[PDB]
C-alpha cells in the first residue's frame, strides 16, 4: 500500500512524501453549491411555462437544436448574482502553486475554476463552459466572451452573431453530445502519470466522466470528499472503501469546503488557504 492508513491523515502523509508528485482532481456540482450554483443535473434542484416534451429536454442537444429559447430564458433565471469560487476551488489553486496539480477534470460549466486561478492548460472542462460562446455557423464560429453573452441573456434577446446573424451558443456540452476531444486526449496521457486522484463534489452518475475513476493505476490512492459515498460497484449492474480488501480508497463525508479545510490543515496549509480565500473573496466583493 502507498497509504499507511485509509484516512485523511494517511492521504496527507502520502501527499507530503516523495511518492506523491502529480495530483488529478475530478470535480462536480458539489464544489459549487456553497457558491450558490445549483446542481443542473439533479431532478430535486419552474419549467411548465415552456412547451417541453419532458423536463430533461431543456438540457438535451436534440431539443436545443429545435428550440433554443427555453434554454436562454432559463439561463436568465439561473444566472448567478456573483461568481465567487469556494474554498474547494482555492484549495486546487494551492495544489497548482505547490507544483502538485497535474490536471483538474471538471463537470461544471460555471467558470469558477478559471476565476480561482486555474489556467486552460490545467483544466479539462469535460462538459464545456460558459466562459466562451461561439457562433454555430460552421463557416463563421466567431467567439464571444461571457460579458457579451450575459448582456444578451438579460436583454431577453436570443444571442445572434454580429458577423453572420447566426445563433451564438455557450461552449457547454448538452446531454447527447460527444465530449470534447481534449477530454479523451488528456485522459490517455494524464492517467499514465497520476499519483493521487482527488474526487470532490461528484456522485459519479454522468458518463463518460464517471469512467475516469477506473483509469487510475491500481496503486494510485483515491480520496472522495463528498456529502455521500459514491463510486462503489453497483450490486445490480469501482471504489472499495469498506471491505477487508480495501487498500487505497478513502471517503471523507461532509461538505466539500470542510473536507478541503481539513486536508489543508493536516498539510500545514490552513493559514495559506485562509489568506488566499479571504483575499480573493474581498477582491470579488469589491468589483
Amino acid at each position: 500500500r502507498l497509504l499507511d492508513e485509509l484516512t485523511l491523515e494517511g492521504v496527507a502523509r502520502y501527499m507530503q512524501s516523495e511518492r506523491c508528485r502529480r495530483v488529478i482532481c475530478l470535480v462536480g456540482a458539489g464544489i459549487s453549491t456553497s457558491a450558490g450554483i445549483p446542481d443542473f443535473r439533479s431532478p430535486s434542484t419552474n419549467l411548465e411555462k415552456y412547451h417541453l416534451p419532458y423536463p430533461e429536454a431543456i438540457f438535451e442537444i436534440s431539443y436545443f437544436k429545435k428550440h433554443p429559447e427555453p434554454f436562454f430564458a432559463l439561463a436568465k433565471e439561473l444566472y448567478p448574482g456573483q461568481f465567487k469560487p469556494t474554498i474547494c476551488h482555492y484549495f486546487m489553486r494551492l495544489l497548482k502553486d505547490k507544483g502538485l496539480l497535474l490536471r483538474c477534470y471538471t463537470q461544471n460549466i460555471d467558470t469558477l475554476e478559471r476565476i480561482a486561478g486555474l489556467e486552460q492548460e490545467d483544466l479539462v472542462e469535460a462538459h464545456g463552459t460558459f466562459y466562451t460562446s461561439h457562433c454555430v455557423s460552421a463557416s463563421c464560429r466567431h467567439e464571444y466572451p461571457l460579458s457579451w453573452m450575459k448582456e444578451k441573456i438579460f436583454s431577453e434577446v436570443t444571442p445572434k452573431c454580429e458577423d453572420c446573424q447566426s445563433l451564438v451558443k455557450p461552449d457547454i456540452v448538452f446531454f447527447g453530445e460527444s465530449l470534447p476531444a481534449r477530454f479523451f486526449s488528456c485522459m490517455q496521457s494524464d492517467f499514465l502519470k497520476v499519483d493521487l486522484l482527488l474526487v470532490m463534489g461528484t456522485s459519479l452518475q454522468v458518463q463518460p466522466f464517471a469512467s475516469l475513476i477506473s483509469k487510475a493505476p491500481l496503486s494510485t490512492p483515491r480520496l472522495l470528499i463528498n456529502k455521500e459515498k459514491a463510486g462503489q460497484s453497483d450490486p445490480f449492474l469501482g471504489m472499495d472503501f469498506d471491505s477487508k480488501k480495501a487498500y487505497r480508497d478513502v471517503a471523507w463525508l461532509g461538505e466539500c469546503d470542510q473536507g478541503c479545510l481539513a486536508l489543508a490543515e493536516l498539510l500545514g496549509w490552513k493559514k495559506e488557504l485562509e489568506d488566499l480565500v479571504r483575499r480573493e473573496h474581498a477582491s470579488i466583493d469589491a468589483q
Partner: peptide
Amino acid sequence: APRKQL
C-alpha cells in the same frame, strides 16, 4: 464519442 448521458 460515447455521448454525455446520466
